[PDB]
Structures are given as C-alpha cells and as structure tokens.
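Title: Request for sanity check on Polymerase acidic protein prediction

Description:
We are preparing a figure and want to confirm that the structure record we downloaded matches what your pipeline produces today. Could someone re-run it with the sequence below and paste the raw structure tokens into this thread? We only need the token string, no images.
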Amino acid sequence: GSHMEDFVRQCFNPMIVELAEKAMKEYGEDPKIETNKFAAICTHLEVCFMYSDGGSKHRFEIIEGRDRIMAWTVVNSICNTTGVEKPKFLPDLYDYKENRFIDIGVTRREVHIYYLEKANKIKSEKTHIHIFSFTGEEMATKADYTLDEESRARIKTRLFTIRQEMASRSLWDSFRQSE
Ligand SMILES: O=c1ccn([C@@H]2O[C@H](COP(=O)(O)O)[C@@H](O)[C@H]2O)c(=O)[nH]1
Ligand SMILES: [Mn+2]
Ligand SMILES: [Mn+2]
C-alpha cells in the first residue's frame, strides 16, 4: 500500500486508471509494486487523449488505450488503406490530415535525450514523434508540432500540475529518479 498508488487513483479519472491497469497487466506488471510506472502510464494516456481532442473532428485515429490485438488491427487497416508503411512499434495516434502515425512521449528528463532514444528505437523515418516534459518543453519531428499552440499549452499546464501535486506529497523526486 504505497502513497503513490493512492495518489494516482485520486489524480486521474477512473477510465484512465482502468486502461492503465489493463496495460500493465498485459505487460505482466503490478500497479501496486511498480507504482511510478503506473503514474507514468496514466500520464501518457491522459496526454494522448487530450492531444486527440486538439484536432478537428475526424482528424485522429486513437491507437493508444486499445487492447494490443485490436490496436494492431487498426494500424493494419490504416496501412492497408492509406498505403503508409507499417510501424515496427505500436504508435499512439494516426493523423488523417497529415497522413502519419504519431508517437507522443512524456519525459521527466531532457526532451532531446528522450527524442533521440525514441528516434533510434522506432527506427522508422515515417512515424512522427512529439515529446512533452514536465517542465513545459516540447520537441517534434521537423519542428512540426501538429496542433495549434493552445492545445499544446493546456497539455503542458496539466503536466506541471501533476508535477506539483507529486512534489507537494514528496513523491516527485522518487518519480523523477525512477524513469
Ligand atoms: O510495451 C510498453 C509500451 C509502453 N510502455 C510505457 O507506456 C508509456 C508510453 O510509451 P510510449 O508510447 O511513449 O512509447 C511510457 O511511460 C512507457 O514506459 C511500457 O511500459 N511498455
Ligand atoms: Mn505508445
Ligand atoms: Mn507514446
């Protein structure tokens, strides 16, 4: 019974918490033990949904939050109908306006460090990358940041609030050092 586990459950909505628990169980991880990661997954989920809510109406297909099998089925449908290259790793969204997959990243460190690690690890010049930090920085493939400033600003605002709530419970340093 960790403080972080109870913090997460009162910080994120129940739909996000339940999708995060499903994800972790599918990874074969336990939210009660790997509690910093439970928090990271919830954060990632929320950002991805707030980001899809930045579009015009039909702009994004949402891949993040589905069951693994259905997630790849939808990836396949998109690849097999837009002719775009099938990514090696599950992305987070598909952008129907710009016809590309996006992988959104949330990091507690330097956005450049994490961008590179992700750049190499995806190994797919095709898939767009967009990184936010808990200090308000972002970095995107080709400096093309997809959404207008307002929709991104509110994401950065929410992450800073999450940081403060953690710091006010002495959970921040432990969560930062665990990445
Ligand atoms: O197989 C996976 C895929 C993703 N993640 C986690 O889900 C979040 C989103 O990953 P990404 O979509 O930014 O790669 C990160 O906090 C990352 O640790 C995993 O633990 N295992
Ligand atoms: Mn993902
Ligand atoms: Mn991502």
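Thanks, this matches our download. The first strand starts at residue 60 and ends at 62.
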